[PDB]
Design a protein around this ligand. Sequence first.
Ligand SMILES: *[C@@H]1O[C@H](CO)[C@@H](O)[C@H](O)[C@H]1NC(C)=O
Length: 602
Amino acid sequence: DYVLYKDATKPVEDRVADLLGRMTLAEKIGQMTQIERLVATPDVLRDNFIGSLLSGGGSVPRKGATAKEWQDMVDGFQKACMSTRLGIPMIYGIDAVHGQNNVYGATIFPHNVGLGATRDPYLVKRIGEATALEVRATGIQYAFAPCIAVCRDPRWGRCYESYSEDRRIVQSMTELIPGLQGDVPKDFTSGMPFVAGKNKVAACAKHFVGDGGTVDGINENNTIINREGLMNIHMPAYKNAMDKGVSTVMISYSSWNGVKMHANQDLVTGYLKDTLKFKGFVISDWEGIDRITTPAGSDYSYSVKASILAGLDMIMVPNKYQQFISILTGHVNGGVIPMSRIDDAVTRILRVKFTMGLFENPYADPAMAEQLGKQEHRDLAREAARKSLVLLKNGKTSTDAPLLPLPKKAPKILVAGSHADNLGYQCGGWTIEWQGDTGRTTVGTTILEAVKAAVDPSTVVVFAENPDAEFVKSGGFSYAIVAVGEHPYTETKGDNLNLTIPEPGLSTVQAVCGGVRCATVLISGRPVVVQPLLAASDALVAAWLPGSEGQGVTDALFGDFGFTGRLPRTWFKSVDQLPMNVGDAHYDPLFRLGYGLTTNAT
Ligand SMILES: *[C@@H]1O[C@H](CO)[C@@H](O)[C@H](O)[C@H]1NC(C)=O
């Protein structure tokens, strides 16, 4: 018989209230629980009334899985959730942070630092639109993006996930949100959640707040800054996210002035909810509540109390769900956490689910599987990669011929370096694995492959990963393209003191450029020590982490398009200067924010 919450014609708030009024405390606490697919089974999902699942980095049904395999996984979990008494569908989240990057064959877009270099918010919106389609190709409805961190110290291992050290650029790139979710209607109230329907995904502004601040660039640590600095650097892009209807916000592992974000009622409830009027749901980071305590996990009862009372709505447990549900149930039953707090959390979670159409379309659309890796999206990623490139040098003296653009017809050319033919390295972190990987880890085009696809048929292309100087001098080359840089990383292994690229990288550039004129392509997540690379090179391009479409690099090297990218952050002279930002008394950059040379298309 008729149940108001099941009626798709009714207003979202009426459906939320109708469902909430029917729910037991177990059904309510279940909605607030997000678990890893690695611990999920149909019985676990039904018995514990689970509200959400995720894949963390690298959590996949198998290596090489097709889009249909992901849809079958997500639907198998959804069938269990739809079989509960109330039939509340789960929402499945994943880090689709530069495309649907855990998935084999997904288009991999440039990381956010390179997107900052484009200064093109419409390009970023189009990337959100394409990412939503590739996430929905795999049956998933929720992406943990954008990271709107304002990275103020490039020693941070996640600096490549920040569009810029300048909050104005980060604010402009919140256009990712209506890409992913759809544009909000003209009448829209700031802070409400929005998703247009089954071809879009819920988004997540992360990590709230000051994740880009931290002392020594140390990940998951203390950001020391006064309120004016928190509010003028780290917070503004959250208001833009409210204006664009971001559906969820994820809290940072970081602390602000010694207070853990996951326990900060003043910021999570007083500011985000009560001042910005955010009406979507607030989600923890991975074991974020565990890390409220030192050591982490040493008083999980307190972690649950502190986080839920701070105003978090959904907890990314993600493994110990039985303990989580047991502890929260105990707190509620003991009067330590009031029912009004549970009811607010569930109201917000249900509001996002109903608003996005999840009750109407809980299952995957098999017709969407073919969106994965679509050529139109690879053409977009190629455009973005080319626009992200920043030309740092194009001739050793003011009187030399500019090396770039290079001619496509030459008798023989050399492609060299550890990063010339390594797809994993050109994608960086958060690609297939959490920390990324080496070699041909997915479908794409390396810089070597892109050169071979670009050049005249008469041009002989020789590859040598690490040639010695004599090989280059004897090879009869017209010029060389040498690609080197950082290996893939995230915070842990990415948080780095010295910011010097691994060897051999510099040695290869010096060997190659000593023998023939060279264009050096530097692959990195951030500024790295660069004076020695510059001294050896005729031309040098900061290519950041350009993703699967290596032809974006060659589109500018061979002059099909001019270089237009500009630094979205300061390039330091030495790591001893750090942190070093505009307005600091010691500001003395090698290249300033906004620097970049240009070429004209040939
Ligand atoms: C590119 O073209 C413009 C005129 O259209 C010219 O002013 C500029 O100097 C050229 N730039 C380069 C790098 O040749």
